[PDB]
Amino acid sequence: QDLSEALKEATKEVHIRAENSEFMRNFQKGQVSREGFKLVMASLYHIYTALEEEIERNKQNPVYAPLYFPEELHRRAALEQDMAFWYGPHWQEAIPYTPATQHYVKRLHEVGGTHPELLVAHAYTRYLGDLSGGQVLKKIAQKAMALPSSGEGLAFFTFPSIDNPTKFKQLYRARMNTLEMTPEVKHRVTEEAKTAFLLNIELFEELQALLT
Ligand code: HEM
Numbered sequence: 044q045d046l047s048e049a050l051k052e053a054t055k056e057v058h059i060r061a062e063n064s065e066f067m068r069n070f071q072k073g074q075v076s077r078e079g080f081k082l083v084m085a086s087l088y089h090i091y092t093a094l095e096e097e098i099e100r101n102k103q104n105p106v107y108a109p110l111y112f113p114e115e116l117h118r119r120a121a122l123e124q125d126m127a128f129w130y131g132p133h134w135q136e137a138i139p140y141t142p143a144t145q146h147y148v149k150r151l152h153e154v155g156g157t158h159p160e161l162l163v164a165h166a167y168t169r170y171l172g173d174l175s176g177g178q179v180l181k182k183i184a185q186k187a188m189a190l191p192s193s194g195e196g197l198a199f200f201t202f203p204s205i206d207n208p209t210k211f212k213q214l215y216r217a218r219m220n221t222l223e224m225t226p227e228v229k230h231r232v233t234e235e236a237k238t239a240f241l242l243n244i245e246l247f248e249e250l251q252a253l254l255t
Contacts, residue, residue, distance in 0.1 A: 046222060046224055046229065047216035050164075050233055053237060057241065058240065060240075062176075064248060066083075066250055070184075073183055075188070081130065082139065082141075082253060083246075084125055085129075086143075088122040090144060090147050090148060090151070091119050092122070092148075093152060094169060095113075095118070097151055098162065098166065101159040101162055106222065107166075110163060110218055110219060115202065115205050118169075141246075141249055141250070143250075146245070151165060154235065158235075160231075163219060163232055164238075165236075165239050167236055167239075168236050168243070173200070174202070174205070174211060174212050178200065184200075
């Protein structure tokens with residue numbers, strides 16, 4: 044079976060669970076405000092920073108290299124503009140770094156530093172969603188919080204170097220399908236994508252408790 048199909052299959056149950064964290068459930072109904080949105084975007088700042096640092100470290104390694112698309116996909120620069128927007132010119136000292144965010148960042152460094160053959164699980168979970176439901180969430184955020192069409196405050200959700208998210212996703216899937224793949228790597232990649240979804244779910248439960 045193709046890696047891209049194995050991953051969709053392996054994560055489709057947990058994706059349902061993630062969709063219905065309270066945080067995502069409120070978000071989707073347009074019950075997201077400045078305070079909750081800044082908590083989640085600052086946490087994403089730390090997460091994509093660690094992920095992209097590990098992508099950089101492993102760019103040349105064949106267990107990852109086919110998925111190396113910094114121009115199209117990387118989010119850290121976009122997150123930095125959003126942080127200056129939401130938190131001001133001194134955002135680096137102001138942004139929170141929560142325990143659930145540290146835990147996710149810690150696993151991303153373990154994977155990148157010691158198990159780079161699993162890094163594709165983590166890029167898949169984040170970037171492919173960002174190119175799917177993330178586009179729907181962007182529209183919801185922008186309406187709930189009165190964010191302008193010009194995109195300030197939502198650079199994270201905008202891919203200026205991808206014309207067509209759907210086509211890019213198909214390309215990225217075909218490329219995932221050309222990684223070296225053995226039963227051993229396939230089994231552990233799909234397991235690591237369930238872990239990445241859980242780390243996301245635990246972040247949302249943590250932020251929701253912070254807010255309430
Ligand atoms: C309520 C919040 C969410 C909404 C509304 C949403 C919505 C969607 C939608 C509509 C798709 C396309 C499904 C398809 O056409 O087959 C999708 C795909 C995807 N989503 Fe989400 N989702 C949410 C939460 C999450 C979370 C928390 C993550 C994990 C961090 C995630 C990761 C992904 C991934 C990796 C895919 C690609 C599936 C594939 O094509 O293999 N989503 N999402």
